[PDB]
Amino acid sequence: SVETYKIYIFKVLKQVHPDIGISSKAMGIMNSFINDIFEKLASESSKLARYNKKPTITSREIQTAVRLVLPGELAKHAVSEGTKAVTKFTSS
């Protein structure tokens, strides 16, 4: 009835720190952070597609939404990882 990102954050945490666990308040904090970032990137992508005259949101303007929304050294890694996935998604 209520869908969240609990499973996926928990799996990522087990992938990073195999032994640390997480309480419920911190779990809510992390869920809210992911929702906030998703909304930011998506709204910027929509508006940036609207500046040009295109009705389609491709991946190459998730690029520039990331480059506008994320600061400096954070974006240069994120962008890279994004490209990684897409390659492994298509040349699969």
């Binding site: 990073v16 992390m30 998506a42 994120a78 996935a85 897409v86």
Partner: protein, 93 residues
């Protein structure tokens, strides 16, 4: 689907969210993949710092205070979360 990409996040749910919010008329195929990768990356970089701050306090579970400290130490995250207030995260001494 999102096992062919090495991700841990749901590409299908991300695409459902993108098409529900009516951000555009058409959504490409690489867009949910790209967006789902750059979200697990940020989750993985916040969680590692929070776990490191947990280890110093001789604790084995993360709490809101640990996220607060991890966000306020690092420069990039503090610049990104510059106006957010974590509930009962205290302050940086």
């Amino acid at each position: 689907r999102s096992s062919k990409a090495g991700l841990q996040f749901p590409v299908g749910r991300i695409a459902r969210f993108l098409k529900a919010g009516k951000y555009a008329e058409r959504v490409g195929a690489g867009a949910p993949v790209y967006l789902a990768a750059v979200l697990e990356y940020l989750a993985a970089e916040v969680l590692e710092l929070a776990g490191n701050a947990a280890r110093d306090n001789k604790k084995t579970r993360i709490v809101p205070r640990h996220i607060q400290l991890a966000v306020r130490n690092d420069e990039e995250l503090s610049k990104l979360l510059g106006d957010v207030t974590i509930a009962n995260g205290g302050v940086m001494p």
